[PDB]
Design a protein around this ligand. Structure first.
Ligand SMILES: [K+]
Ligand SMILES: [K+]
Ligand SMILES: [K+]
Ligand SMILES: [K+]
Ligand SMILES: [K+]
Ligand SMILES: [K+]
Ligand SMILES: [K+]
Ligand SMILES: [K+]
Ligand SMILES: [K+]
Lengths: 310, 310, 310, 310
């Protein structure tokens, strides 16, 4: 079976109450659609009012300088667009015209107010900054001061902060319960700092996120040899608020069994030049292999505790 | 007595400082109300200014092409709606007219700015996306790798994420204190992942939320037999931010004693077809019963610890 | 010395970089101020451009139907307010006029866009909903299933939720360190659910917040008799997001030594009528006294542990 | 090597997918840029439409009172700015003109709606309130009721709250792993209240943040004498939401080895005058030295435990 989350963040799952917010069905779409639909609803109000204008216009013979429905449209414009050329002006004789304008004048400033709002949000869409946050292309497993770690690397490309940025990881893997319940893409959390507040990053330059593999880690029992065989996939989530706007964004990625590398280790990406720190974004995804025991974290521990014991 | 929260999210409780924010009294209402009140306040400003316009107009005899108060309204329009037909134009002779326009011109662009804002928020109301988040219709109680669990199922229907989505549960049940204090619909939290960060979901496909029933669970003492008799109600809360807009939404639901099912178990809703995961939303609320001890979680434990002991 | 926070939420403390956000100096003010300043800056742009218009107008003799600076103002209006009467129209002969309009036309739609924004936020100010959240007028201390508690009561008046609502408390009291450092209004946290997630409320009807007084509570050593003498003040903070808008609000209050009541107990405010829960907001602040040991929580404990011991 | 974060908050690090949000590349810039670019895109639409207007205008000979491209611009204005002088009015004879206006009329109210939005956010930028939050200029190390502390001081200058304000600290220092991995500006968290909820401030007057130096602190092994030699830098982060708007802001600062002062102690900044608390912001950064053991926190402890032991 094939992966839940694509390396780039989109998921591999497809799914009446979408009119309960006819708002959000709009915001997901793409530009040329909106631009036309904007016009669609803009165009139609001019038909709608232009028909109703001609409805009370035909009854009359409130109207100056018109000939057909070609003029009911261009009058409907001088109104809603509040252009008002003053060639086709309003006149007093009839008691019907004013209160239609009043219907329109308000409604035309409603159609605008509705649709400055949606434009704004479309522009301001947070998910866009999900582009300028990046993950390393592989995760690695290797030793760090005695304990075995699973490490992936995280980055922010834009010169400005993404405030309140945290991270979490989820292990996805089907399992069976002693009882017999199969649970298809079951999700359990991976400790990446939660308990100390170390998962609350400070993302000014690329950081290495490190999950230590201990009795509670999923990778406790997994040795180098077993790893390739294992059918797990690690989902990785960076969440934070765009300094620029309070908008709260999220960046996902994924590691599948074959993208975790046993015994390797990230290239450093930092150096100092004339007062600024230099990120060599070339070295970002790069890793190298070092000497790394091949045993599971568990077997590795016992070999330690037998040493201290003797 | 009858339930606190309706399966759909509204609560069964009814309640001077509502003018301390005359803002929020507006936003709760329904469309046809606003649409009229918008017009109400729109219409009245044209009366108000039109009266005041005629006030200084009568004194004059700043005014061109008017006859009655029929013209003070249509002039009041060419101003506020900034239409300005140029049939009824301003003129210099009087020192009074300009500074009224200046009162209006600003105020007309105030009445707009006020009421693009409220339109926007009404459109953008987060609570709307509370529709596209769903809970299972029943909760169940059954075994999962040895420990007894209370499980309900949670979903997101819309193809897009609801960011930073967490969950919590509250047990509502009246109680008495040794002391004698009766406490009517008293609320205590149910562990659904809080301590590990497992309550911080990743809601891409329906998940099963599971509260393990241990010494600290409310359901420690409750056996299958006792359950029907118990007068509890579990309130369930999903909170998160709409990816689309930073708006922070909340979805509630409820389980009452008779909607928890002992010994059952959710149907899986997942399958893989040609590269996409298939949610069979038909199987969403569906459960089946499996073999499940009928004892309380407590009695079930002791029977275990007596086994290990011997 | 006198209290830090007034029962109503304002604090009793008074305080170059206020132009680093000339934004927020604006939003704190009151309506009549804005309304005038709006006009102030609106009025002045018409002077400013009207002077500059007459500057290039005098040079000319781009201009139709003007006499003095009375017309440079009313032309400056038909421009910025985009009214454009078409009595005073633009003309081609001069190469200077168009690019000033272009300066203005853009700037007039800037002055608007600037000041729809601030209007909006002023309207939408979250702190307003700090009015519809209420605290009980007193806190009490009395027993709850064996342990001694400090309890105050919290409410939401508006029929709609305030999402993600939590609570915290701070103990304020000057102290001295063995070392000798005096620390004037020093602040330490009071446990009101933090460790279990019980401080994350569900505020649909008034709840009683309860801090159990244990070895870690500030009130461990304080007996009934000592209480009046103690110079402490408890600050109470309710934080949450307005369901209506993502705006994140905060409601404070305070308890000083003499407003905590030993041995009392809140009146219940709940009852059920024909399917709706009835909050008797009359009974909201009301308490009564019950039988309550007068000893400190500490002395009360030891008397227990000596009992179990024997 | 030189510091990661400047005392004022900017970092000392410099860094295709910046068009994936051409939104945020805009908001970082400075006023005079926007003001011109606004005009840039405003000016060009009048060229663009004015050319296209003349395109179908030349074909004609929909047009009244024009001479060259000087009029195609001033007509393009009476349209987009919705000024509509009514000297140059629309006419019926041609079937081409109306649907271009309809292209424009909508697009002109799009260019506006786009660029009220960005104006707004630029105005409302949260990072601005990062100016009115301040840190003390030095941190100090000295005793507080027996335990050794690292303390820095934090403030809010503006009379209004910054809601939900928390604090965290990061220790930055390169290190080597037994294994051999060098890790250049490696980041580990410093406890400043996280575990008790004491890092969740109530910032009404300047507070002293205190990290107790215990077995888990980085400063466990560091004595007064060693301190100057150590190459560490403490990064300090205040995060919270502007009461005024939900915008979520962040304020950083930094302490390098030589800005931590062993044996000193902050001057109190509080006093009471006629009912208001007086902050003497003069005493804000000020410290004095007191009698302070010079040993590391570790050696200091053992000397204690040897005392209790005997
Ligand atoms: K914690
Ligand atoms: K927000
Ligand atoms: K107009
Ligand atoms: K106009
Ligand atoms: K006009
Ligand atoms: K925790
Ligand atoms: K916790
Ligand atoms: K006109
Ligand atoms: K905690």
């Amino acid at each position: 079976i094939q992966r839940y989350v694509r390396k780039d963040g989109k998921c591999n799952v497809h799914h009446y109450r979408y009119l309960t917010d006819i708002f959000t069905t709009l915001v997901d779409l793409k530009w040329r659609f909106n631009l036309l639909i904007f016009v669609m609803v803009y165009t139609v109000t001019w038909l709608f009012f232009g028909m109703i204008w001609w409805l009370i216009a035909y009854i009359r013979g409130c109207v100056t300088n018109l000939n057909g429905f070609v003029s009911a449209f261009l009058f409907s414009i001088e109104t809603e667009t509040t252009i008002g050329y003053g060639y086709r002006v309003i006149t007093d004789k009839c008691p019907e015209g004013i209160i239609l304008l009043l219907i329109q004048s308000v409604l035309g400033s409603i159609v605008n107010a509705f649709m400055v709002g949606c434009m704004f949000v479309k522009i301001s869409q947070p998910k866009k900054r999900a582009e300028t946050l990046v993950f390393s292309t592989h995760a690695v497993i290797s030793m760090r001061d005695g304990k075995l770690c699973l490490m992936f690397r995280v980055g922010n490309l834009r010169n400005s902060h993404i405030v309140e940025a945290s991270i979490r990881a989820k292990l996805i893997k089907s399992k069976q319960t002693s009882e017999g319940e199969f649970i298809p893409l079951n999700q359990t959390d991976i400790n990446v700092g939660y308990y100390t507040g170390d998962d609350r990053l400070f993302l000014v330059s690329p950081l290495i996120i490190s999950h230590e593999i201990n009795q509670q880690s999923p990778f406790w029992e997994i040795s180098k040899a077993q790893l390739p065989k294992e059918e797990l996939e690690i989902v990785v989530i960076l969440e934070g608020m765009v300094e620029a706007t309070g908008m709260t964004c999220q960046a996902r990625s994924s590691y599948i069994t074959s993208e975790i590398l046993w015994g390797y280790r990230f290239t450093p990406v930092l150096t100092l030049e004339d007062g600024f720190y230099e990120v060599d974004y070339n070295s970002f995804h790069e890793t190298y292999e070092t000497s790394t025991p091949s045993l599971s974290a568990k077997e590795l521990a016992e070999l330690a505790n037998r040493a201290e014991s003797n």
